[PDB]
Design an enzyme around this catalytic site. Structure first.
Site, PDB file in Angstrom:
ATOM      1  N   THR A  82       0.878  -1.133  -0.132  1.00 46.15           N
ATOM      2  CA  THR A  82      -0.052  -0.009   0.061  1.00 46.15           C
ATOM      3  C   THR A  82       1.005   1.319  -0.110  1.00 46.15           C
ATOM      4  O   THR A  82       0.442   2.346  -0.521  1.00 46.15           O
ATOM      5  CB  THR A  82      -1.047  -0.177   1.335  1.00 46.15           C
ATOM      6  OG1 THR A  82      -0.217  -0.167   2.432  1.00 46.15           O
ATOM      7  CG2 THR A  82      -2.000  -1.063   1.118  1.00 46.15           C
ATOM      8  N   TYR A  83       1.962   1.182   0.583  1.00 46.28           N
ATOM      9  CA  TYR A  83       2.968   2.176   0.465  1.00 46.28           C
ATOM     10  C   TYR A  83       3.759   2.525  -0.495  1.00 46.28           C
ATOM     11  O   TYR A  83       4.409   3.468  -1.046  1.00 46.28           O
ATOM     12  CB  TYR A  83       3.910   1.912   1.730  1.00 46.28           C
ATOM     13  CG  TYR A  83       3.170   2.733   3.194  1.00 46.28           C
ATOM     14  CD1 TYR A  83       3.546   3.875   3.619  1.00 46.28           C
ATOM     15  CD2 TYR A  83       2.395   1.710   3.895  1.00 46.28           C
ATOM     16  CE1 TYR A  83       2.729   4.365   4.648  1.00 46.28           C
ATOM     17  CE2 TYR A  83       2.121   2.289   5.161  1.00 46.28           C
ATOM     18  CZ  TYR A  83       2.023   3.656   5.480  1.00 46.28           C
ATOM     19  OH  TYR A  83       1.603   3.998   6.562  1.00 46.28           O
ATOM     20  N   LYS A 117      13.033  -0.627  -3.005  1.00 49.21           N
ATOM     21  CA  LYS A 117      11.540  -0.413  -2.470  1.00 49.21           C
ATOM     22  C   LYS A 117      11.338   0.950  -2.499  1.00 49.21           C
ATOM     23  O   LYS A 117      11.886   1.749  -1.886  1.00 49.21           O
ATOM     24  CB  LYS A 117      11.817  -0.746  -0.756  1.00 49.21           C
ATOM     25  CG  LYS A 117      10.506  -1.070  -0.185  1.00 49.21           C
ATOM     26  CD  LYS A 117      10.842  -1.785   1.198  1.00 49.21           C
ATOM     27  CE  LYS A 117       9.616  -2.419   1.912  1.00 49.21           C
ATOM     28  NZ  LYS A 117      10.008  -3.355   2.976  1.00 49.21           N
ATOM     29  N   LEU A 125      18.525 -10.517  -3.119  1.00 54.61           N
ATOM     30  CA  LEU A 125      18.769 -12.047  -3.094  1.00 54.61           C
ATOM     31  C   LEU A 125      17.802 -12.978  -3.808  1.00 54.61           C
ATOM     32  O   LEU A 125      16.626 -12.259  -4.299  1.00 54.61           O
ATOM     33  CB  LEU A 125      18.258 -12.242  -1.443  1.00 54.61           C
ATOM     34  CG  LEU A 125      19.830 -12.228  -0.605  1.00 54.61           C
ATOM     35  CD1 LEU A 125      19.591 -10.742  -0.240  1.00 54.61           C
ATOM     36  CD2 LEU A 125      19.742 -13.076   0.733  1.00 54.61           C
ATOM     37  N   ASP A 176       7.021  -9.253  12.478  1.00 53.95           N
ATOM     38  CA  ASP A 176       6.597  -9.524  11.247  1.00 53.95           C
ATOM     39  C   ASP A 176       7.346 -10.954  10.603  1.00 53.95           C
ATOM     40  O   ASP A 176       7.347 -10.976   9.356  1.00 53.95           O
ATOM     41  CB  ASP A 176       6.459  -8.356  10.372  1.00 53.95           C
ATOM     42  CG  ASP A 176       5.444  -8.890   9.187  1.00 53.95           C
ATOM     43  OD1 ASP A 176       4.318  -9.582   9.646  1.00 53.95           O
ATOM     44  OD2 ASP A 176       5.327  -8.171   8.162  1.00 53.95           O
ATOM     45  N   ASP A 179      12.226  -7.184   5.830  1.00 53.40           N
ATOM     46  CA  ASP A 179      11.154  -6.754   6.015  1.00 53.40           C
ATOM     47  C   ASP A 179      10.944  -6.207   7.509  1.00 53.40           C
ATOM     48  O   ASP A 179      10.231  -6.644   8.265  1.00 53.40           O
ATOM     49  CB  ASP A 179      10.024  -7.350   5.487  1.00 53.40           C
ATOM     50  CG  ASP A 179       8.636  -6.429   5.416  1.00 53.40           C
ATOM     51  OD1 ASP A 179       8.694  -5.278   5.854  1.00 53.40           O
ATOM     52  OD2 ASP A 179       7.527  -7.073   5.027  1.00 53.40           O
TER      53      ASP A 179
END
Ligand code: ADP
Ligand code: CL
Ligand code: MG
Ligand code: MG
EC number: 2.7.11.22
Lengths: 296, 257
Positions: free
Chosen positions: A14-15, A33, A83, A127, A145
């Site tokens: 969403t970001y 990212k 990776l 997470d 993450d």
């Protein structure tokens, strides 16, 4: 962003988006990212602020390397080492054959080393799940993450209730404890360990109550003896069905005694008794650990 | 988390040296002074109370501010902008529910615009290079508190009060590391409430003997004695509350060990 060639989209959120990309000048392949700020009337998202600031301190072989941060008016780019793939894709490709036990042991051992490093630097991941774990062609696996990560205090205080992905979420969170700590990360790794062994999610709930019951049906419904204080947790109900604990020989058939021992300690109900990353590394299960190459 | 407690303390002791602002930076600022910094921080205390922010958030913001001012010249008309962006960043880092930027703008009575605060957030991030996970006096205190069994909530409230007072006065507290300030605060608080002294267990863990705390302890004792007279009063008002055992109403000891 002139110097980066986008090669393919490997993730989305969403970001923003995650790309595989190459540096046009050096040839280096990276993961890019992208985080939108324009859709951000709040400026830089707290999730990004935490991810960047915490990653910069976390220098370890089993934690993904942040190479650069490019901060513009409209966009924020995090540049990571690239990776081969995440553990979920690997597990899917291995769903028929199974991951060899020596490799499972190597991955768990490495994950524990990365996690212990996090915890020793007062960082909670929050997470841990297969898709946030990255493997290369040489047999390494790394935590990734850190968007849900947080620096913690000693002793801890109340942190965000809505954290870990349901399937990997610890029971103290499900039952609404005011305090949780490093033990939530160990629970997640416990679930992942069993997942690698059996080729399927240990506790694939479809709601918080369903998640709780799946745990109860496997490990037995917790009581004040197994878990002092449990019946006083905010979301505990005395009307919960009372299931008996299953034998691990049924839960994780392929696993030897040491594996079953370690797994049960990683899934102890009582956060205070649950094995730590450090202690886990000293478990006899790892006495023979090697670093096999995966099959891609 | 007893398994990592030692590692974490060790790590924080290394980080506090790296995240340490430059002790004499105010001499090199052409327009702002220690008195203006004190007014800013006192105001941040009130802001934190208004939005029920954590004490840790306050301590981080001060760290950000002092580090930013250690390398950037700032005119007096922009000092509060630096402070507001710092509090916003500290909130995003530390809080579950950070206030939105529009609220930070409101709390300055429209002195600055949203655009300004967001642009200042970007500049602070750039200047600090996203190194926001700083060790604070607060973090060391909560670890020190563990050596009290059973816990003494009044001693804890007083220690926090004293630690917070140190944020106001760059001179002299900028010259001490957070771990050391936290030790003096803890000892002074313990001594005041119970007449006991800094624990042997803490002397071993931290390497600080009661004598090594002395310099900071003498300063902290004076600060404590003169608190009712200080031009800035937001911290005393805050700690008169029952949730802090009204510790700011307690009489400081006349002399020390
Ligand atoms: N460094 C990397 N190397 C290879 N693949 C990556 C890397 N980082 C992310 N990915 C892929 O992109 C996906 C999303 O990245 P992640 O950092 O988890 O972002 P999000 O917060 O959106 O989940 C991951 O599941 C992974 O498959
Ligand atoms: Cl996943
Ligand atoms: Mg992810
Ligand atoms: Mg994420």
């Amino acid at each position: 962003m002139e110097n980066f060639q986008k090669v393919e989209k490997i993730g989305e959120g969403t970001y923003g988006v995650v790309y595989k990309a190459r540096n046009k000048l050096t040839g280096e392949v990276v993961a890019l990212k992208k985080i939108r700020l324009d859709t951000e009337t709040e400026g830089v998202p707290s999730t990004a602020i935490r991810e960047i600031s915490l990653l910069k301190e976390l220098n370890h072989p089993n934690i993904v390397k942040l190479l650069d941060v490019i901060h513009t008016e409209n966009k924020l780019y995090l540049v990571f080492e690239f990776l081969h793939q995440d553990l979920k894709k690997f597990m899917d490709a291995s769903a028929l054959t199974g991951i060899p036990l020596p490799l499972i042991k190597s991955y768990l051992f490495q994950l524990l080393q990365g996690l212990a490093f996090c915890h020793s630097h007062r960082v909670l991941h929050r997470d841990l799940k297969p898709q946030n774990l990255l493997i290369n062609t040489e047999g390494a696996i790394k935590l990734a993450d850190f968007g849900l990560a947080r620096a913690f205090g000693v002793p801890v205080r109340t942190y965000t209730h809505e954290v870990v992905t349901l399937w990997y979420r610890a029971p103290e969170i499900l039952l609404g404890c005011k305090y949780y700590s490093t033990a939530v990360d160990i629970w997640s790794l416990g679930c992942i360990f069993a997942e690698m062994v059996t080729r399927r999610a240990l506790f694939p709930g479809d709601s918080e109550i369903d998640q709780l019951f799946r745990i109860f049906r496997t490990l037995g419904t917790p009581d004040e003896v197994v878990w002092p204080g449990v019946t006083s947790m905010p979301d505990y109900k005395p009307s919960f069905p009372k299931w008996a604990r299953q034998d691990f020989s049924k839960v994780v058939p392929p696993l030897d005694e040491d594996g079953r021992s370690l797994l049960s300690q990683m899934l102890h109900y009582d956060p205070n008794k649950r094995i730590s990353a450090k202690a886990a590394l000293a478990h006899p299960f790892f006495q023979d650990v090697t670093k096999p190459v995966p099959h891609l | 988390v007893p398994d990592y407690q030692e590692d974490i303390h060790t790590y924080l002791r290394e980080m506090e040296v790296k995240c340490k602002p430059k002790v004499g930076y105010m001499k090199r600022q052409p327009d702002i002074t220690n008195s203006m910094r004190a007014i800013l921080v006192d105001w941040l205390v009130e802001v934190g109370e208004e939005y029920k922010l954590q004490n840790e958030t306050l301590h981080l913001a001060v760290n950000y501010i002092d580090r930013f001012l250690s390398s950037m010249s700032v005119l007096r008309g922009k000092l509060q902008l630096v402070g507001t962006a710092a509090m916003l960043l500290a909130s995003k880092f530390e809080e579950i529910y950070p206030p939105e930027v529009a609220e930070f703008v409101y709390i300055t009575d429209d002195t600055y615009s949203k655009k300004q605060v967001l642009r200042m957030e970007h500049l602070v991030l750039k200047v600090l290079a996203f190194d926001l996970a700083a060790p604070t006096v607060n973090q060391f205190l909560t670890q020190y508190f563990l050596h009290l069994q059973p816990a003494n909530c009044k001693v804890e409230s007083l220690a926090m009060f004293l630690g917070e007072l140190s944020l106001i006065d760059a001179d002299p507290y900028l010259k001490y590391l957070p771990s050391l300030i936290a030790g003096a605060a803890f000892h002074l608080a313990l001594y005041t409430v119970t007449g006991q002294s800094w624990p042997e267990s803490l002397a071993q863990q931290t390497g600080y003997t009661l004598e090594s705390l002395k310099p900071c302890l003498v300063d902290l004792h004076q600060t404590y004695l003169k608190a009712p007279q200080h031009a800035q009063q937001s911290i005393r008002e805050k700690y008169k509350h029952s949730k802090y055992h009204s510790v700011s109403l307690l009489n400081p000891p006349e002399t020390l060990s």
